[PDB]
């Protein structure tokens, strides 16, 4: 189990995030499970930990982690393009997660 990752939280929850891949059906491969993602990603305060863009990729990794080990404890292993389909999801979700400390972190961070 985890237990112990050091300043991170669970958020409230949102709703499904839309991602416009690049292809008509890489816009849809996503979409046609997208059901089976979560409400929520964890996260930790901005604090200046690298950027948002040296955090948002442990962000991700953090969320999808739980996804992976869900299945991986069976041994399905899990392919760079479906992670991609994730993680798509877990940066929109992460960035709306981030983006209610950016106001602060910021001076407005607007919308």
């Given at each position: 189990?985890?237990?112990?990752?050091?300043?991170?939280?669970?958020?409230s929850?949102?709703?499904?995030?839309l991602?416009?891949?690049?292809?008509?059906?890489?816009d849809?491969?996503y979409?046609?499970?997208?059901?089976?993602?979560?409400?929520?990603?964890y996260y930790?305060?901005?604090?200046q930990?690298?950027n948002?863009?040296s955090?948002?990729?442990?962000?991700?990794?953090?969320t999808?982690?739980?996804?992976?080990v869900?299945t991986?404890?069976?041994?399905?292993?899990?392919?760079?393009?479906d992670?991609?389909?994730?993680?798509?999801?877990?940066?929109?979700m992460?960035?709306?997660?981030y983006?209610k400390?950016?106001?602060a972190?910021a001076?407005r961070?607007?919308?």
């Amino acid at each position: 189990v985890v237990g112990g990752l050091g300043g991170y939280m669970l958020g409230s929850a949102m709703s499904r995030p839309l991602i416009h891949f690049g292809s008509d059906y890489e816009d849809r491969y996503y979409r046609e499970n997208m059901y089976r993602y979560p409400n929520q990603v964890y996260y930790r305060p901005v604090d200046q930990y690298s950027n948002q863009n040296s955090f948002v990729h442990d962000c991700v990794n953090i969320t999808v982690k739980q996804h992976t080990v869900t299945t991986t404890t069976k041994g399905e292993n899990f392919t760079e393009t479906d992670v991609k389909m994730i993680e798509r999801v877990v940066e929109q979700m992460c960035i709306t997660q981030y983006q209610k400390e950016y106001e602060a972190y910021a001076q407005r961070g607007a919308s």
